[PDB]
């Protein structure tokens, strides 16, 4: 139902 | 409620956490942290198939390093030089194509300059 996204480096 | 790790400037410490292995949803584990007053930042992530991704933030390249033991179904962060801007609560969260997704209790730690 829903997350937390920790995005990997740009 | 304010415990958690301590260690001085130039210290190292470090984090493990349990990797039962890939599934059809997730392909790594890694770390994120959160100091105070601050957003969640990505600090590392490991593939579960040697070779695959080993991401690290800009901030601790050079000073941390992800590892996995397949066998023990863990994953290591070692920290060395670790630095007063170091200061957070560090969590572990599996890993997509290195990305990390936390579906709901972290490990604080203060380093001293």
């Given amino acids: 139902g829903s997350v937390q996204i920790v995005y990997k480096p740009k | ?113």
Wanted: hydrophobic share 30%; net charge negative.
């Fill in chain 2, 1 to 113: 409620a304010s415990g958690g790790v301590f260690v001085q400037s130039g210290g190292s410490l470090r984090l493990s956490c349990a990797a039962s292995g890939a599934t059809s949803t997730f392909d790594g584990m890694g770390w994120f942290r959160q100091a105070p007053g601050k957003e969640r930042e990505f600090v590392s992530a490991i593939s579960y198939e040697q070779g695959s991704y080993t991401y690290y933030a800009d901030s601790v390249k050079g000073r941390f390093t992800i590892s996995r033991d397949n066998s023990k179904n863990m994953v290591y962060l070692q920290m060395n030089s670790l630095r007063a801007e170091d200061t957070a609560t560090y969590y572990c969260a599996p890993a997509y194509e290195g990305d990390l997704y936390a579906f709901d209790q972290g490990t604080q730690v203060t380093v001293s300059s």
